[PDB]
């Protein structure tokens with residue numbers, strides 16, 4: 133079964149045959165589409181087919197399908213599964229799996245970069261302190277004095293699910309939030325709950341509007357521990373605007389390294405509950421979401437005020453005006469400090485090229501339109517007019533519940 | 544199976560039960576989501592009719608009543624006898640208001656019940672059609688105080704006699720292929736502007752020439768008609784801050800009146816059913832002016848603003864885009880023509896969602912189409928989870944008439 137997708141600005145039409153390799157479900161049925169829903173212990177019984185399928189994929193990519201190298205690996209993994217109830221990935225296999233999870237991420241606009249991914253094998257890690265060491269190295273390498281490099285660090289896979297390695301933070305670097313008695317929030321509203329945990333776990337909080345949270349790390353299913361990232365490793369950028377000299381006086385900064393640390397990496401049926409990975413920011417992540425979402429730093433009002441905007445009727449589009457300026461500032465500040473960042477036009481254009489290339493070379497490129505289209509100026513980026521097919525391939529990055537909701541406390 | 548939707552900006556949760564009444568299909572499966580794809584007999588007809596009449600008599604609190612059963616019987620008889628049937632005016636009105644209500648891509652549905660239905664089922668000719676349309680245009684325009692309306696021409700019979708309005712909107716600007724290679728007027732209407740010329744229209748070859756009407760009655764060849772200019776309200780576009788704006792020579796028409804869709808009620812197919820409301824600002828400003836495949840005025844506007852167009856990261860496309868959309872809203876408001884901004888409209892739609900969840904048990908919505916084409920995440924709909932499914936009565940798409948019409 134072939135499937136065509138069309139781009140209504142260029143009339144370019146592409147055919148998908150890759151969706152036939154799709155395993156997991158979408159949340160959708162013939163009678164309901166849930167494409168806008170945000171969030172729609174494993175036995176040997178189901179493990180080996182996942183192993184085989186994965187290993188068949190792997191040996192195809194290295195062009196050794198059916199070889200003795202292929203077959204003996206299957207034989208090896210097989211035996212290890214019924215003997216030990218799990219199995220270990222070779223280094224080559226781990227690397228492949230990670231890159232491909234990235235490549236399979238249907239919600240990711242940055243996947244043109246997927247082949248260049250520095251994989252750090254942290255599978256020999258046994259403790260929280262060990263975790264801290266690995267993570268510090270990750271940051272230092274990834275940051276690279278502002279010239280950011282994609283990377284992922286991979287901690288021990290899940291076994292019986294009672295011995296999970298988890299990074300409790302949603303991103304390695306992120307600013308504290310503090311609900312005040314009066315109801316106002318200080319710092320980042322997104323991280324209030326996590327800050328409370330951290331504070332409870334012993335963290336002494338500076339209580340400023342921009343405090344870098346401590347790492348909260350759990351190894352082998354033990355109670356998580358706190359660690360301060362050395363400040364010298366945390367690259368931040370003061371936000372200024374090129375024309376408005378009062379912008380700097382708003383006192384905004386942001387960190388340079390987006391490093392997501394709460395997702396689950398699945399490869400050949402193996403689950404990696406701690407797999408922090410990092411790239412570089414698209415400006416609208418900071419400029420549109422981080423500053424301008426109502427449930428976040430919410431500076432729209434103050435920026436609009438300082439710009440003397442007609443804030444009386446929304447039909448003055450003051451909100452829209454202030455948003456654009458804030459995004460201009462974010463990009464200007466990062467480029468001025470030589471810290472890698474991409475604007476939303478550049479990134480969406482790159483993605484379209486990537487995707488075209490993926491259809492030609494791979495038979496498709498699963499993509500979630502709801503997530504790919506940037507949160508401002510949608511229709512003036514080329515992805516808005518791009519039809520996209522959404523489906524799920526393994527290896528994949530998956531959501532997993534907040535560890536504080538599931539963890540069994542020792543003492 | 545009793546689905547929940549969450550707004551991630553306000554933590555509001557609504558439970559959807561209304562989807563379980565869904566009749567048509569989505570294009571999606573458990574293996575593939577197609578939510579971003581633009582367009583995925585006597586025995587057939589009675590079930591369809593019964594479902595409609597069931598919901599109608601339920602809506603008037605007469606479910607299972609004698610009147611219900613009597614009507615169900617009467618229609619059942621007519622179908623057996625005539626291989627079709629006719630809607631009582633009340634059913635027709637109910638069905639139209641509900642097809643709008645069920646339009647999952649429409650951000651405007653808060654207004655759904657205040658729709659004026661003009662029954663044009665007695666119409667027989669294209670001339671008759673023209674008269675009905677003129678009347679619709681004048682009622683709806685209402686000197687700039689726009690009112691929603693739909694005019695419904697005879698339903699389909701045997702497919703050989705359909706009524707069709709060939710224009711996609713009653714009012715749209717012509718577009719012509721320049722020898723110089725580019726495009727003058729509206730590029731989206733080039734083939735139609737040709738077909739009108741190709742059918743005898745005398746194009747003034749301008750930039751904003753109102754297209755003529757191509758009306759087809761009873762499966763006949765379509766006829767040309769000019770809307771009386773005094774009925775076409777237009778708005779010159781000026782910026783409230785930039786005086787140079789006026790010299791770009793831009794205007795737009797006030798009445799958005801979609802005319803190429805098929806209205807389906809109780810299994811019957813109204814292939815000619817032009818309807819109209821009022822514009823959300825972005826429809827003209829973001830889409831009609833700045834889409835590359837349209838009037839694409841972005842570059843030129845930005846130039847007038849002397850923005851750094853050397854690198855994409857100066858966000859100059861974004862800056863201009865806002866100003867353009869400010870001007871559109873400013874012009875319409877100043878000339879007292881009804882228009883809504885995307886902040887106001889989306890806010891209303893969330894409130895309308897609330898209402899439909901409460902009073903009806905849900906509200907089908909297509910996020911890809913509800914979220915405006917600019918400033919997406921600073922509108923409430925962006926963080927609003929939605930469920931998409933298809934209820935009847937509905938507006939469906941239908942092929943362009945030329946591709947089908949037996950001449």
Ligand code: HEM
Nearest residue numbers: 234237239240241242245282409410411412413414417529
């Ligand atoms: C290097 C440059 C990259 C850019 C510019 C980029 C950009 C983005 C953006 C903007 C999102 C949506 C975020 C949001 O607004 O919520 C996203 C999603 C995502 N990215 Fe990328 N990304 C990059 C690299 C990576 C890397 C290195 C990985 C992993 C190896 C990755 C994996 C993902 C995944 C799994 C999602 C889905 C988020 C979810 O499902 O919640 N990305 N990307």
Ligand code: HEM
Nearest residue numbers: 643646648649650651654691692818819820821822823938
């Ligand atoms: C009264 C004010 C109204 C507003 C502000 C409004 C707004 C909108 C907008 C912005 C769209 C997206 C269209 C696009 O971007 O091309 C849309 C689609 C739609 N509207 Fe509404 N509308 C209004 C009235 C109506 C009326 C009176 C009807 C029918 C009786 C209607 C039925 C529809 C349908 C069926 C669609 C989607 C068509 C499709 O499936 O492609 N609307 N509307």
Ligand SMILES: CNCc1cc(OCc2ccc3ccc(N)nc3c2)ccc1Cl
Nearest residue numbers: 170171242390392410411412413414417
């Ligand atoms: C269910 N919520 C999804 C969600 C995903 C998130 O991860 C987004 C994400 C993931 C990987 C990224 C990699 C690079 C980059 N520049 N941004 C990236 C952004 C963040 C917040 C939320 Cl709320």
Ligand SMILES: CNCc1cc(OCc2ccc3ccc(N)nc3c2)ccc1Cl
Nearest residue numbers: 581651799801819820821822823826830
């Ligand atoms: C650019 N949009 C494409 C498209 C629009 C369509 O109708 C848009 C439409 C329909 C009804 C409307 C009613 C009011 C209004 N302001 N806009 C309205 C816009 C139908 C099919 C397609 Cl493919």
Ligand SMILES: C[C@H](O)[C@H](O)[C@H]1CNc2nc(N)[nH]c(=O)c2N1
Nearest residue numbers: 516517518519579580581911912
């Ligand atoms: C590719 C995508 O399906 C297509 O461009 C859609 C996206 N969302 C839209 N939304 C509206 N309101 N109108 C449109 O024409 C479109 N186009």
Ligand SMILES: C[C@H](O)[C@H](O)[C@H]1CNc2nc(N)[nH]c(=O)c2N1
Nearest residue numbers: 168169170502503925926927928
């Ligand atoms: C309800 C909806 O799915 C949700 O708000 C999505 C919309 N699109 C998004 N797109 C990006 N890039 N990031 C997001 O968090 C979201 N949120």
Ligand SMILES: [Zn+2]
Nearest residue numbers: 160165571576
């Ligand atoms: Zn779907």
